Structure 1
Amino acid sequence: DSRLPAFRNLSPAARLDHIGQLLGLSHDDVSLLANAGALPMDIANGMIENVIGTFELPYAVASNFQINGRDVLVPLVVEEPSIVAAASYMAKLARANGGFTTSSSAPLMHAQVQIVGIQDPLNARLSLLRRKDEIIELANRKDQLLNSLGGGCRDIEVHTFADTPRGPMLVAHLIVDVRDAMGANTVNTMAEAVAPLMEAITGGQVRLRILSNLADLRLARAQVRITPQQLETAEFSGEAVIEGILDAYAFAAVDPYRAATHNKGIMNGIDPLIVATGNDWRAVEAGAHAYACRSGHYGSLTTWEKDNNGHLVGTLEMPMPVGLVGGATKTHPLAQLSLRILGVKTAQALAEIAVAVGLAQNLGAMRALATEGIQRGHMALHAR
């Protein structure tokens, strides 16, 4: 059960103990949170360069979250107040209608093999596509362990840019199926592995061989439904809040200035979960925002509609390149503990949870903005 009565009123230690026997955490786990210094300086000096100490941020746990029926405790790490309070409140509201319904796609990341110096980019493109299976085999032969787990290269997509400032270019895409890893290093290696062969076929000169953070092939989805009766406040009625939420969305869909803050709200829920799991939060931000302006217009990441049943339905679909076997995820004592609290067994499972927390946050942010204002809640929670 994710519901935690009077949890916000409970003392930190009381909370850590409650969460402890609830999940059945060993003392060895509770001690990592009980005392400061869970990350030894010998390990901290192994992650970054020029380490002189450690910086710490609050480690909270959101409640009420329910993904596909299964209850789950979401660990968050931020400095901004109201975030954990809103994510949990909206999560409580979604419960009454089935919580959050999520889904995802195969962990498909893609490398880029930039080739310049070609005089016939278009012709050379077909040369690559026709010898695609060769290029694929070579890529896989490098990372066979990945193929053992069911991952590996799946397909190649060659694109051209004859309008490049520095002459025509040929950018081939290696759609590699990573597994429970973000795929950064896995993909980057395959890119540098096939680099020689592609260069031999097109007769060009390979430049960059890096992955693309705009993982539009590794999407994660999340849905919610909010009955008007649930949003009925003392002043405003249920119906009144729904229209407001809809106006707030229309605004963000047409004006980039509002879209910026709107999407920022979404990230406020996703980022904290990423830092806690030890994942690269910057990769998530880059793929999120870039996907938000894929139609030549910076728009909203979430969508808020009112089904023909009167209910408020919102969704969230965005690139979610997150892992479980990554570098920092395995070396940080708390990163491993975060995964244990979540109970996630795969990267995509974690991905689905991340987009659910975001969809919830955005809902809470807009509900307040349309209800009264933003100061009442945030500022109250923003004491001192």
Structure 2
Amino acid sequence: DSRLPAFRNLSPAARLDHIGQLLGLSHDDVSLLANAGALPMDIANGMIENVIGTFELPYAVASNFQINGRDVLVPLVVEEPSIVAAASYMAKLARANGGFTTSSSAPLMHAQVQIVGIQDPLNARLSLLRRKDEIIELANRKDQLLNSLGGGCRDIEVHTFADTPRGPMLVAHLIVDVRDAMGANTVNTMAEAVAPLMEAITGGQVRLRILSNLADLRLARAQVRITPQQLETAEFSGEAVIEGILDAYAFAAVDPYRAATHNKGIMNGIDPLIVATGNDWRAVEAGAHAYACRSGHYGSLTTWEKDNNGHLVGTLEMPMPVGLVGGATKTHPLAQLSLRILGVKTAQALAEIAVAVGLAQNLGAMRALATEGI
């Protein structure tokens, strides 16, 4: 049960105590939050290079979230007010109608291998595709463990660019199935091993061998339904507010100046969760915003409509390159704890929670804005 009545009135120590009893945490865990210094300097000096101390940010916990029926507590680390309050309130509303409904695709990541110096990029492309099974097998031969976990390279796609400032180039894509890992190193490794062969097949120089942060093959999705009776303020009817939100949505879907702000609101709830779990927040931002203008125009990541029942329905589909076996998510005592609070077992389970927070957050911001909030 994620509903915490009068939680925003309890003192921090009482809130911790509560979450402690609720989740049945050990004292060793509660101590990590009740006492500054959870991250020892000896560990902190190992993550970054010229460490001189530590920087603190508030570690909150949103309430009311319900994902696919199960309740869950969402830990968020951020410095801006109203985010947790709005995420939580909006989550409260979604409850009556079934909470958030999520889904996701297999944890697929791209690995790009740039190849220059080819006089025949187009022919060369077909040479790679015919000896495709060969390359794939050479890639999986390296990361054997991964294959046992149920991951590994699954397919290859080659794209050519014949109109580049530095001549034509060929770009092969390794579509690797990482696993509960963000996939930066697993993918970058396969790209390095496969390189020698591709260079032999095509006859050109391999330049970059790196992953693409535009994980359009690793998407997380979320949905909500909000009844007009739920949004009814004092001077505004339930339906009049919905029309307001749709107006705001349409506005973002056509003007990039608003879209940027619209999408920032979304990340307002996603990033904090990512930082809380010790995940790279830059990778999610880059993938989120790069996906927004996939159709040649920077637009809305979410979508808001009114269904047959005159109910507000909203969606959010975006890349979620997140992980549980990552670098920092493992060494930071508090990050390990966040995952314990979340109760998530797969990276994708965590991704589904991240897009729900953001969807709730976008709705919260839009409601405030559409409610003539002066």
TM-score norm. by structure 1 comes to: 0.97
Shift of 1:86: 0.2
What pairs up with 1:341-380 in 2 under 5 angstroms?
341-373=341-373
2:75 is aligned with 1:45: no
| SS class of match (2:7) | coil
Q: In 2, Cα distance between the equivalents of 1:120 and 1:373?
A: 60
| SS class of match (1:39) | coil
C-alpha offsets along residues 213-243 of structure 1, whole Å, 9 cap, x if unaligned?
0000000000000000000000101001000
Shift of 1:328: 0.2
Q: In 2, Cα distance between the equivalents of 1:373 and 1:264?
A: 19
C-alpha offsets along residues 38-90 of structure 1, whole Å, 9 cap, x if unaligned?
00000000000000000000000000000000000000000000000000000
C-alpha offsets along residues 330-375 of structure 1, whole Å, 9 cap, x if unaligned?
000000000000000000000000000000000000001001226x
2:226 is aligned with 1:226: yes
C-alpha offsets along residues 139-191 of structure 1, whole Å, 9 cap, x if unaligned?
00000000000000000000000011100000000000001000000000000
2:145 is aligned with 1:145: yes
Shift of 1:308: 1.1
Shift of 1:325: 0.2
Q: In 2, Cα distance between the equivalents of 1:261 and 1:20?
A: 36
Q: In 1, Cα distance between the equivalents of 2:213 and 2:313?
A: 29
- Residue equivalent to 1:381: none
RMSD across aligned C-alpha pairs, in angstroms?
0.4
- Residue equivalent to 1:6: 6
| SS class of match (2:233) | coil
Q: In 1, Cα distance between the equivalents of 2:259 and 2:313?
A: 19
Q: In 2, Cα distance between the equivalents of 1:165 and 1:101?
A: 46
- Residue equivalent to 1:202: 202
What pairs up with 1:303-322 in 2 under 5 angstroms?
303-322=303-322
Shift of 1:5: 0.6
Q: In 2, Cα distance between the equivalents of 1:235 and 1:84?
A: 26
| SS class of match (1:3) | coil
| SS class of match (2:115) | strand
C-alpha offsets along residues 236-293 of structure 1, whole Å, 9 cap, x if unaligned?
0100100000000000000000000000000000000000000000000000000000
Q: In 2, Cα distance between the equivalents of 1:235 and 1:324?
A: 46
C-alpha offsets along residues 66-122 of structure 1, whole Å, 9 cap, x if unaligned?
000000000000000000000000000000000000000000001000000000000
| SS class of match (2:344) | coil
| SS class of match (1:64) | coil
Q: In 2, Cα distance between the equivalents of 1:358 and 1:22?
A: 25
Q: In 1, Cα distance between the equivalents of 2:300 and 2:196?
A: 41
Structure 2, gaps ≥5 residues long: none
| SS class of match (1:224) | strand
| SS class of match (1:158) | strand
| SS class of match (1:8) | helix
What is the percentage of aligned positions where both structures have the same residue?
Answer: 100
Q: In 2, Cα distance between the equivalents of 1:9 and 1:240?
A: 32
| SS class of match (1:113) | strand
Q: In 2, Cα distance between the equivalents of 1:71 and 1:235?
A: 33
Q: In 1, Cα distance between the equivalents of 2:174 and 2:323?
A: 19
Q: In 2, Cα distance between the equivalents of 1:97 and 1:199?
A: 56
Q: In 2, Cα distance between the equivalents of 1:237 and 1:68?
A: 30
Q: In 2, Cα distance between the equivalents of 1:150 and 1:313?
A: 35
| SS class of match (2:9) | coil
Q: Which runs of 4+ in 1 moved over 2 A?
A: none
The number of residue pairs the alignment matches comes to 374
